[PDB]
Amino acid sequence: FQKKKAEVCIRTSQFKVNKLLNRKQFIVEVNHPHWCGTVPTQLIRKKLATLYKVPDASQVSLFGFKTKFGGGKTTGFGLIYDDLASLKRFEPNYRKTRMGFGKARLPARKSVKERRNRNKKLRGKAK
Amino acid sequence: SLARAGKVKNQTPKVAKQEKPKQPRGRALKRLKYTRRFLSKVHMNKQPPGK
């Protein structure tokens, strides 16, 4: 054993170009032989953006990372969109909330259900 | 009569269990039993004679 700096190497598999949703789809597998814990998603995002010559890193979407048993390797799914606008238009809202530009959470569904059920007793102007 | 229920259990002098060292559990217990039964007409619990 020799003590050395933590290194992270990105690999990409099953690459596909999607014109329909303005993005590239691929599985991303990360190798981190000496990494303390899990490599955060933002780090993999920056590394992948540098690797694929993407002008901006926010147009890369990553999710569903599964660390391998035994350590030293994690695998996930990645999306590189043609630009930021495509990303914000086509992304599921929870993934946009992960990257910080999602929508606010709606009120509790119990309250919406109760208000909807109250209105069924009312006629026009009141409801 | 029903009045003698529990006669012998109540009569029996109370004897405390003695604090023995703890036996190994699991695979180690099997290891111990294997090294006692082998690697050592066989009587597994032979008692001293007595009257």
């Binding site: - | 009569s1 029903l2 003698r4 229920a5 529990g6 012998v8 259990k9 109540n10």
Partner: protein, 141 residues
Amino acid sequence: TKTNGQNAARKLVRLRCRNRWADKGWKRAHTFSARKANPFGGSSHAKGIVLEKIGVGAKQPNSAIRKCVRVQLIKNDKKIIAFVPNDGCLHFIEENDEVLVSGFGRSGHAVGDIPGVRFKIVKVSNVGLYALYRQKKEKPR
């Protein structure tokens, strides 16, 4: 001796159907008389209320007073005799106590030297009787 004909299937089917009734176990399994007469109504256990503590003398050549309780079953008001299965465990049982009863192991047959009892106590006041016996629990109230 038996019929052997190649087209004699109906005779064999009817013969087996008729003779299957001679098997006591099959007949008990395919009739309602045992289930009706059975105080548990086909259940494995039954809850009941203790009417009185009684002493049943063991059968010859044994000589003992087997401690039992007369209990009325909650589900159907049937009255049975149930054995109290350990040393001094009769003192855990009081009149009007709620009691859980099981079979004695021989599916309605009497067991051991206890003459006509086919039941035993396993719980009293919702705690295991053997648990009270080993002082693993306390009797409520």
